[PDB]
């Protein structure tokens, strides 16, 4: 299991530099497969991520969602866990989140994510 | 626009060292609140706030409007420690600010000062380690003093941006 | 005095030279972190939350409780003010406070503050 | 500090209407020059610079100093048209600046005006499509007045550039 | 009037429908481009330099030179004021000016000017 | 041929994503192997890229260098041609450069590559 290792925050643009790596993808839910085993998320710059679930969905995902999982050889995320951001007070600014994510990567010495 | 600063900067740059005061803005977290002097005996007069003298004679003397009264007036004068990721700053906060940082009014506060020595310390315990945006005047003093002109609840989306630009700016070098 | 925004990963890296704490050339006492609550135990003397910020395995954060019990449920983002405590060489977090997250933008901003923080802080 | 503004911004924000002037700065390229008036005859007493009248008798009079003189002093007052990636604007450059843009003191430079009519056309060519940092005043009667012209600094202009693109994604 | 800094790739691409030129939806008149000189031929009516900015294949720039002969040597960096001249679906550049760069920082700044300018113009 | 193809402007930390692509690498001349056949250029973030020549240097190299070439499998750059930036007048700001390189790639749409 991955919940005990570092999990890099990324957007669609990175998916291919993270093949086989445990990650943390945050984006807005756009479409969920019928067999609720494959939904997709649009990151903060609009690029799209394809989240695959080893198992079918109980409740209804929707809105901003954070997924943790491992990047596939086909540049997708086999999702191990996901949480839905709380927005009842304020709408989560996804484009800002995105600028942070790029900032994290431009300065890994200030936001470590290895070992 | 706003004069955004960091504690280290206000110190470092020497704001308030000279002639007239200096005004700056920073985001900070309150790290400590002194519960002692936080409250004083206030002239009961309209808009007057001088400290009334306790004439043990059941009466209260405001030296400013040279009058005496029975009634009382409570007024906050909260000494606080605000700190950021690099520094801290002892700032004094009158009625206005302090009521924001604490949650209640000088009336409601001072009273509970007698009643429960605890339910009181409760408000002070709670209010600590919270963040706000502070507008802060700064000028020298002899026997540098800091006065909290305003207090707003931090806006994160906007501090996020500000921070972002700051990082990018730090990069250009 | 001053209070430093960090990530767990950086806490784990700090060392205790001369009974003090450093993340590189930075001395750290009080620190904040934002993260999600994965586990919460009442214990009998204080609460013990396993808190995750995705940057390393979840850290233990315990705060003194009273008994003479409001536990933040799991799956909830929370900022945490408090100080780092090295013991048996493992690292844990001792919690001055634990404000659950109201506005999730606060969490984004934290990242930004952790990064901004250690940049200025490293001369 | 400085009031950097694009020309479309200077126009847009309507600098110039207010009761007092406005000042901005920009980096633009001289896109055209109007040699049409560029020079004029001026009181040759140092510091007055009125358009002396030619008495046609080989004497000129300055209705300010209240004096007739025999001699001269030519002065520049160039109408320049500058542009950026999105707009252009007509300004007017007096002595100091104009010599900065053409490279020749109006003094010397003016005599040539008539000597070689094509040699004049020399500068008004080599000067065109050159770029600068412009300090500009603006009132209404709007009216741009070039307070100063410095050669563009690309490194600094560069940084300013990087910061605005980024500022732009924070939408 | 207004001059648009572009990249050769943006030109080769431009469409000319409606008798006008539009890269993206931006219509371009005059333009500037920085690039390095790969070839130069003194012809008799005008010079012809092949200029590279790496975004695409080096495009042709023509400057009308008189003769009633000092060419910019190859492998030197120049900025170029001019305008997109489409001819038989074969884009070219007609050169008002052609100045070599003394300070290569200008080269860097252009890239920025380009991207900056098109972002602003586009909407 | 190289010179008639669009070449992407990259920094050392991009080599990996331009495996086998035609690029343009600007940087500073650090080490310059004794065979003269290979040299190292440091980009504007301090990171290094290795440049390989098909024929040992014909001259003395120094300062800022622009290399055009294809990205090898060992993530180095087989150089087709190189240029030395003219500095005698104004020192070249290699860092401002890099900042531009990142933007070229953050904003493809406003600085396209290829027709
Ligand atoms: Zn009174
Ligand atoms: Zn006169």
Coordinates of C-alpha atoms in Angstrom, one line a residue, chain C residues 48-89:
Chain C
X48 CA -4.1 11.0 18.9
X49 CA -4.7 11.8 15.3
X50 CA -2.6 10.2 12.5
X51 CA -2.5 13.3 10.1
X52 CA -1.5 13.2 6.4
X53 CA -0.3 15.9 4.0
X54 CA 0.5 13.5 1.1
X55 CA 4.3 14.3 1.4
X56 CA 5.5 11.3 3.5
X57 CA 3.5 8.8 5.7
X58 CA 1.0 10.3 8.0
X59 CA 2.5 11.9 11.2
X60 CA 1.1 11.4 14.8
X61 CA -0.4 14.4 16.3
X62 CA -1.6 14.4 19.8
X63 CA -3.2 17.1 21.9
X64 CA -3.9 17.2 25.5
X65 CA -7.6 16.6 26.2
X66 CA -9.6 16.9 29.4
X67 CA -11.7 14.3 31.2
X68 CA -13.6 15.4 34.4
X69 CA -14.6 14.5 24.0
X70 CA -14.8 16.4 20.7
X71 CA -12.7 14.4 18.2
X72 CA -12.4 15.7 14.7
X73 CA -13.7 12.9 12.4
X74 CA -11.5 11.3 9.9
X75 CA -11.3 12.5 6.3
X76 CA -11.2 16.1 7.3
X77 CA -8.6 18.7 6.5
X78 CA -7.3 20.6 9.4
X79 CA -4.5 23.0 9.9
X80 CA -2.5 22.3 13.1
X81 CA -0.4 24.8 15.1
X82 CA 2.0 23.1 17.5
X83 CA 5.6 21.9 18.1
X84 CA 7.8 19.1 17.0
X85 CA 8.8 16.6 19.5
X86 CA 11.6 14.1 18.9
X87 CA 11.4 11.1 21.2
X88 CA 13.1 7.6 20.8
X89 CA 14.2 9.3 17.7

